[PDB]
Design a protein around this motif. Structure first.
Motif, PDB file in Angstrom:
ATOM      1  N   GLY A  20       0.832  -1.187   0.000  1.00 13.19           N
ATOM      2  CA  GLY A  20       0.000   0.000   0.000  1.00 13.19           C
ATOM      3  C   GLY A  20       0.871   1.243   0.000  1.00 13.19           C
ATOM      4  N   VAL A  21       0.554   2.229  -0.842  1.00 13.71           N
ATOM      5  CA  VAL A  21       1.356   3.452  -0.929  1.00 13.71           C
ATOM      6  C   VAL A  21       0.396   4.617  -1.076  1.00 13.71           C
ATOM      7  CG1 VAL A  21       3.119   4.750  -2.176  1.00 13.71           C
ATOM      8  CG2 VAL A  21       3.309   2.252  -2.051  1.00 13.71           C
ATOM      9  N   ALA A  22       0.590   5.659  -0.279  1.00 16.78           N
ATOM     10  CA  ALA A  22      -0.069   6.935  -0.530  1.00 16.78           C
ATOM     11  C   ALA A  22       0.996   8.005  -0.476  1.00 16.78           C
ATOM     12  CB  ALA A  22      -1.180   7.279   0.484  1.00 16.78           C
ATOM     13  N   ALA A  23       0.903   8.979  -1.373  1.00 17.52           N
ATOM     14  CA  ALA A  23       1.769  10.137  -1.240  1.00 17.52           C
ATOM     15  C   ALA A  23       1.000  11.391  -1.629  1.00 17.52           C
ATOM     16  CB  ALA A  23       3.035   9.988  -2.082  1.00 17.52           C
ATOM     17  N   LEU A  24       1.416  12.517  -1.055  1.00 21.02           N
ATOM     18  CA  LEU A  24       0.822  13.823  -1.337  1.00 21.02           C
ATOM     19  C   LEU A  24       1.957  14.804  -1.598  1.00 21.02           C
ATOM     20  CD1 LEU A  24      -1.410  15.996  -1.498  1.00 21.02           C
ATOM     21  CD2 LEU A  24      -1.199  16.244   1.015  1.00 21.02           C
ATOM     22  N   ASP A  25       1.921  15.465  -2.750  1.00 24.72           N
ATOM     23  CA  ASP A  25       2.873  16.533  -3.055  1.00 24.72           C
ATOM     24  C   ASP A  25       2.228  17.844  -2.648  1.00 24.72           C
ATOM     25  OD1 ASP A  25       4.535  18.528  -4.143  1.00 24.72           O
ATOM     26  OD2 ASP A  25       4.853  17.463  -6.014  1.00 24.72           O
ATOM     27  N   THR A  26       2.699  18.459  -1.556  1.00 25.17           N
ATOM     28  CA  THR A  26       1.962  19.637  -1.103  1.00 25.17           C
ATOM     29  C   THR A  26       2.166  20.850  -2.005  1.00 25.17           C
ATOM     30  OG1 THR A  26       3.729  20.419   0.336  1.00 25.17           O
ATOM     31  CG2 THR A  26       2.197  18.826   1.281  1.00 25.17           C
ATOM     32  N   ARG A  31      -1.683  13.412  -5.784  1.00 24.51           N
ATOM     33  CA  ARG A  31      -1.694  12.242  -4.919  1.00 24.51           C
ATOM     34  C   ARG A  31      -1.280  10.992  -5.681  1.00 24.51           C
ATOM     35  NH1 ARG A  31      -4.109  12.783   0.403  1.00 24.51           N
ATOM     36  NH2 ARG A  31      -5.163  14.819   0.583  1.00 24.51           N
ATOM     37  N   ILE A  32      -0.405  10.202  -5.061  1.00 21.76           N
ATOM     38  CA  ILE A  32      -0.108   8.857  -5.519  1.00 21.76           C
ATOM     39  C   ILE A  32      -0.913   7.897  -4.658  1.00 21.76           C
ATOM     40  CG2 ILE A  32       1.656   7.098  -5.877  1.00 21.76           C
ATOM     41  CD1 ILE A  32       3.669   9.390  -6.241  1.00 21.76           C
ATOM     42  N   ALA A  33      -1.579   6.937  -5.307  1.00 17.40           N
ATOM     43  CA  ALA A  33      -2.454   5.992  -4.629  1.00 17.40           C
ATOM     44  C   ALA A  33      -2.187   4.606  -5.183  1.00 17.40           C
ATOM     45  CB  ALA A  33      -3.930   6.359  -4.827  1.00 17.40           C
ATOM     46  N   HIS A  34      -1.716   3.706  -4.325  1.00 15.65           N
ATOM     47  CA  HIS A  34      -1.559   2.295  -4.670  1.00 15.65           C
ATOM     48  C   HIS A  34      -2.211   1.498  -3.543  1.00 15.65           C
ATOM     49  CE1 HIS A  34       0.432  -1.027  -6.881  1.00 15.65           C
ATOM     50  NE2 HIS A  34       0.407  -1.607  -5.694  1.00 15.65           N
ATOM     51  N   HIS A  35      -3.402   0.946  -3.805  1.00 22.37           N
ATOM     52  CA  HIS A  35      -4.240   0.359  -2.750  1.00 22.37           C
ATOM     53  C   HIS A  35      -4.379   1.309  -1.577  1.00 22.37           C
ATOM     54  CE1 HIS A  35      -2.530  -3.303  -4.814  1.00 22.37           C
ATOM     55  NE2 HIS A  35      -3.822  -3.359  -5.078  1.00 22.37           N
ATOM     56  N   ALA A  36      -4.480   2.608  -1.876  1.00 24.09           N
ATOM     57  CA  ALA A  36      -4.417   3.610  -0.817  1.00 24.09           C
ATOM     58  C   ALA A  36      -5.690   3.683   0.026  1.00 24.09           C
ATOM     59  CB  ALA A  36      -4.112   4.996  -1.407  1.00 24.09           C
ATOM     60  N   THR A 154      -5.659  -0.736  12.384  1.00 21.00           N
ATOM     61  CA  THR A 154      -5.375  -0.433  10.981  1.00 21.00           C
ATOM     62  C   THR A 154      -5.738   0.999  10.621  1.00 21.00           C
ATOM     63  OG1 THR A 154      -7.579  -1.196  10.202  1.00 21.00           O
ATOM     64  CG2 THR A 154      -5.782  -2.829  10.185  1.00 21.00           C
ATOM     65  N   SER A 155      -5.235   1.429   9.470  1.00 20.22           N
ATOM     66  CA  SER A 155      -5.785   2.593   8.794  1.00 20.22           C
ATOM     67  C   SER A 155      -5.529   2.410   7.308  1.00 20.22           C
ATOM     68  CB  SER A 155      -5.172   3.892   9.331  1.00 20.22           C
ATOM     69  OG  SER A 155      -5.842   5.007   8.755  1.00 20.22           O
ATOM     70  N   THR A 156      -6.002   3.383   6.488  1.00 15.68           N
ATOM     71  CA  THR A 156      -5.677   3.313   5.066  1.00 15.68           C
ATOM     72  C   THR A 156      -4.475   4.197   4.773  1.00 15.68           C
ATOM     73  OG1 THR A 156      -7.175   5.141   4.532  1.00 15.68           O
ATOM     74  CG2 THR A 156      -8.111   2.877   4.492  1.00 15.68           C
ATOM     75  N   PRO A 157      -3.635   3.869   3.786  1.00 15.66           N
ATOM     76  CA  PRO A 157      -2.516   4.784   3.472  1.00 15.66           C
ATOM     77  C   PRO A 157      -2.947   6.226   3.258  1.00 15.66           C
ATOM     78  CG  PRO A 157      -2.082   2.679   2.467  1.00 15.66           C
ATOM     79  CD  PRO A 157      -3.508   2.587   3.062  1.00 15.66           C
ATOM     80  N   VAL A 158      -4.069   6.486   2.568  1.00 17.47           N
ATOM     81  CA  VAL A 158      -4.438   7.879   2.319  1.00 17.47           C
ATOM     82  C   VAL A 158      -4.837   8.571   3.624  1.00 17.47           C
ATOM     83  CG1 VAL A 158      -6.889   7.395   1.714  1.00 17.47           C
ATOM     84  CG2 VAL A 158      -5.705   9.456   0.792  1.00 17.47           C
ATOM     85  N   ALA A 159      -5.529   7.863   4.523  1.00 19.33           N
ATOM     86  CA  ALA A 159      -5.830   8.488   5.811  1.00 19.33           C
ATOM     87  C   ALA A 159      -4.559   8.715   6.624  1.00 19.33           C
ATOM     88  CB  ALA A 159      -6.843   7.642   6.600  1.00 19.33           C
ATOM     89  N   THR A 255       8.741   9.505  -4.393  1.00 21.45           N
ATOM     90  CA  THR A 255       9.379  10.818  -4.384  1.00 21.45           C
ATOM     91  C   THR A 255       9.990  11.151  -5.740  1.00 21.45           C
ATOM     92  OG1 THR A 255      11.426   9.901  -3.432  1.00 21.45           O
ATOM     93  CG2 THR A 255       9.755  10.747  -1.903  1.00 21.45           C
ATOM     94  N   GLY A 256      10.476  10.151  -6.477  1.00 21.57           N
ATOM     95  CA  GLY A 256      11.001  10.426  -7.803  1.00 21.57           C
ATOM     96  C   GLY A 256       9.919  10.872  -8.768  1.00 21.57           C
ATOM     97  N   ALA A 257       8.712  10.326  -8.614  1.00 18.65           N
ATOM     98  CA  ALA A 257       7.620  10.674  -9.513  1.00 18.65           C
ATOM     99  C   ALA A 257       7.094  12.074  -9.255  1.00 18.65           C
ATOM    100  CB  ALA A 257       6.488   9.655  -9.379  1.00 18.65           C
ATOM    101  N   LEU A 258       7.240  12.571  -8.031  1.00 21.46           N
ATOM    102  CA  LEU A 258       6.763  13.895  -7.685  1.00 21.46           C
ATOM    103  C   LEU A 258       7.818  14.970  -7.920  1.00 21.46           C
ATOM    104  CD1 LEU A 258       4.814  12.798  -4.450  1.00 21.46           C
ATOM    105  CD2 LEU A 258       3.926  13.241  -6.763  1.00 21.46           C
ATOM    106  N   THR A 259       9.067  14.579  -8.135  1.00 21.94           N
ATOM    107  CA  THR A 259      10.168  15.525  -8.267  1.00 21.94           C
ATOM    108  C   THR A 259      10.876  15.357  -9.601  1.00 21.94           C
ATOM    109  OG1 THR A 259      11.825  14.048  -7.215  1.00 21.94           O
ATOM    110  CG2 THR A 259      10.618  15.561  -5.725  1.00 21.94           C
TER     111      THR A 259
END
Length: 259
Positions: A20-26, A31-36, A154-159, A255-259
């Motif tokens: 599971g991956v979530a990322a946020l570029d502020t 947002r990156i979401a993989h089963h997020a 538990t929680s979700t990656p996006v949360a 981080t590479g995808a956001l930068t």
């Protein structure tokens, strides 16, 4: 034949677990979401919310952070490298927060949950801060069992990303307490091994049964706006070995995808 896949889809395929991956570029909301939006085990990452709950109370009670907790050695479970070493003196609530966040000290986590009102009090703080997904159900160490299907602890990656941004970058806490949480979380594997060199990282890792690794972080790449990141990897076999390299690879891709 070759099947074109995204970098995270390829990492998922090659790793043979549940990722599971979530990322946020502020800088731009990306947002990156993989089963997020699937649940993953919190493991020790609950400590971010537990320390924030302590800090929110400390803002109204100047006696809380310097309060000395006297505890006996049977009150800190295995996995307590700092609290075991100070059993003769006790430790302050602030010292316990640092130990829980920096050293994964499980006894410190239970002692602080005793102050707060149990894992349900950690959950109530998450809920009041706007996170209706997070749930901490158990104490140390059982909260880390990470059994397949189980939604406890538990929680979700996006949360996880949204809550961490509110705590370290947003206004959930007063600014002095936000800074203190940041300092505790900034003082080599996993997310830290996947970010660009020179990045400032505020992070908390957790591990568990089923070879689970869960990590959350705010990453400030050199002279770049912060990225918020949550990664969890969990496996099919209850005795599996943790794969921190998978977490590092997910952090490097995101981080590479956001930068």
């Amino acid at each position: 034949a070759h099947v074109a896949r995204s970098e995270l889809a390829a990492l998922d395929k090659a790793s043979n677990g549940r990722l599971g991956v979530a990322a946020l570029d502020t800088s731009n909301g990306t947002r990156i979401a993989h089963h997020a939006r699937e649940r993953f085990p919190l493991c020790g990452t609950y400590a971010v919310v537990a320390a924030a709950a302590i800090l929110a109370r400390a803002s109204l009670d100047a006696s809380l952070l310097p309060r000395r907790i006297l505890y006996r050695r049977y009150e800190v479970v295995a996995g307590s490298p700092v609290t075991e070493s100070h059993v003769d003196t006790g430790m302050t609530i602030a010292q316990l927060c640092a130990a829980m966040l920096q050293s994964g000290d499980k006894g410190a986590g239970n002692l602080l949950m005793n102050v707060l009102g149990g894992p349900q009090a950690v959950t109530a703080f998450a809920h009041e801060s706007g996170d209706t997904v997070f749930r901490l159900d158990r104490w140390e160490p059982e909260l880390n069992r990470a059994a397949p299907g189980d939604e406890r602890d538990t929680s979700t990656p996006v949360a996880m990303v949204d809550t961490l941004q509110r705590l370290l970058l947003g206004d959930t806490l007063q600014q002095a307490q936000r800074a203190q949480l940041t300092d505790w979380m900034t003082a080599a594997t996993g997310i830290a091994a996947g970010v660009p060199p020179g990045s400032r990282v505020a992070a908390k890792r957790g591990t568990g049964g089923y070879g689970t690794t869960t990590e959350v972080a705010v990453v400030w790449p050199p002279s770049r706006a912060p990225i918020v990141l949550a990664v969890s990897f969990t496996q099919a076999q209850a005795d599996a070995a943790a794969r921190a390299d998978v977490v590092a690879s997910a952090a490097r891709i995101a981080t590479g995808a956001l930068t």
